[PDB]
Copies of this chain bind each other. A is one copy, B any other.
Amino acid sequence: GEWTILERLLEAAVQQHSTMIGRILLTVVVIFRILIVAIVGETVYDDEQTMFVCNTLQPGCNQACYDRAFPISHIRYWVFQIIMVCTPSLCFITYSVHQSSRFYIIQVVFRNALEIGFLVGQYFLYGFSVPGLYECNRYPCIKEVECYVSRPTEKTVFLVFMFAVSGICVVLNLAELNHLG
């Protein structure tokens, strides 16, 4: 979508005083999250429902089994996570005009809570792999039927990579949280 609005909002939010860990965390967020989702990830999840098939003759069973197997797309969860993680750093724009280190501590606390919450939610929603087969027993499908997934190896690679990057950002958040004391 419109990633340049977020770019220009983030350029005015990086004028805040930050520590070494905070700048390393912003570098990891800018490179390993925004550039990869905004360039590479969009096209992978383009034909997810078009190339999703089930072995049946029942109308409406493809929609039911696709919605049951993929309640939320990976790419939209990652975009929402990117937006939510950068919110505490975007509240500096609002806070600066109010004055024209307590805020920094509050930002660190909120950022750690968001990073851990999203990492745990990513583990519970998806897991670690995307298999190539699905078993569906949802109405209007008759008993259990079998369905086939589009590009499962290339979505397992994104899941593993994203989980690794989120774990890195969680470690840096806890490092800075310990640094403040």
Contacts and interface: CB of A to CB of B under 8 A. Distances in A.
Interface in A59-104: 59-60, 63-64, 66-67, 71-73, 76, 79-80, 83, 87, 90-91, 93-94, 97-98
A71 B60 CA distance: 21
A80 B161 CA distance: 11
A1 B143 contact: no
B154 A73 contact: yes
A17 to B, nearest CB: 11
B90 A44 contact: no
Size category, A interface: 35 or more
Contacts of A98: 20, 23
Interface stretch (A34-42, A106-114, A167-175): A34-42
A154 B94 contact: no
Interface of A: 1-9, 20, 23-24, 26-27, 30-31, 34-36, 38-40, 42-44, 47, 49-51, 53-60, 63-64, 66-67, 71-73, 76, 79-80, 83, 87, 90-91, 93-94, 97-98, 132-133, 139-140, 142-154, 157
